[PDB]
């Protein structure tokens, strides 16, 4: 599916001292919050070069 | 209260002097019907209600 | 010369349904033939000459026969489309051939 791995709202937390700059799922109160997104290396993300 | 007293009169031939009502925390209505002094509520409960 | 500077991926059309559409068209043609039996499935078409100097060496099928053609052939214009003859009123006969 063309929308697989992209049905999330996520932004990176910026350059800092603790974590990497992958986009992280915003919000709170669940395990998904703060987790990585949108990357082919990320769990529950879009693959590299999706098949058409 | 009028519906409750008329229903009691139609069902069990019960005449009441007054009726108090509340709504329980479960959502059902509770009605205290005080009967006339001529009729005995214990005889009504034993015979018609069967609450012994 | 690659015209891929728009949002081209939103209107890419593939043709996986080409044999299925051929099957559907053949089924529709068979149903039309069964409904129109014993008449032919198509109407009679005139022979006309293509316009411009590139294609005026070749003839082909036109839309319908002219009113003058039907009058000379002796077929009334109200009878003609009811017996499988296509009729065109816009076309005229500028020559006798």
């Amino acid at each position: 599916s063309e929308k697989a791995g992209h049905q999330t709202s996520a932004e990176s937390w910026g350059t800092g001292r603790a974590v990497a700059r992958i986009p992280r799922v915003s919000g709170g109160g669940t395990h998904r919050a703060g987790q990585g997104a949108f990357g082919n290396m990320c769990r529950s993300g879009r693959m590299f070069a999706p098949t058409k | 209260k009028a519906q409750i007293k008329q229903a009691l009169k139609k069902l069990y031939d019960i005449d009441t002097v007054k009726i108090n009502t509340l709504i329980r925390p479960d959502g059902t209505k509770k009605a205290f019907a005080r009967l006339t002094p001529d009729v005995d509520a214990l005889d009504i409960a034993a015979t018609k209600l069967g609450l012994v | 010369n690659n015209h891929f500077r728009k949002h081209w991926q939103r209107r890419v059309r593939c043709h996986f349904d080409q044999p299925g559409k051929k099957v559907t068209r053949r089924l529709a043609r068979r149903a039309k033939a069964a409904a129109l039996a014993p008449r032919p499935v198509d109407k009679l078409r005139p022979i006309v000459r293509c316009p411009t100097v590139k294609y005026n060496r070749r003839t082909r099928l036109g839309r319908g026969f002219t009113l003058e053609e039907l009058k000379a052939a002796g077929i009334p214009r109200l009878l003609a489309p009811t017996i499988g003859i296509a009729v065109d009123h816009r076309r005229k006969n500028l020559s006798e051939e």
């Binding site: - | 709504i23 329980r24 925390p25 479960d26 959502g27 | -």
Partner: protein, 50 residues
């Protein structure tokens, strides 16, 4: 509060009736997957949001 509307009290009544553990005969059914009440509510843990 003690002052409450009828709609609020009715929804609180529904929440009070829903606040229970599952019956014990449920776990003995054939092919059951329900082990506990996963929507159980407590007055100190999760708000009703009224």
């Amino acid at each position: 509060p003690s002052h409450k509307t009828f709609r609020i009290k009715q929804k609180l009544a529904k929440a009070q009736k829903q606040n229970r553990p599952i019956p014990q005969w449920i776990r003995l059914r054939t092919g059951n997957t329900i082990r506990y009440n996963a929507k159980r509510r407590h007055w100190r843990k999760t708000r009703l949001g009224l």
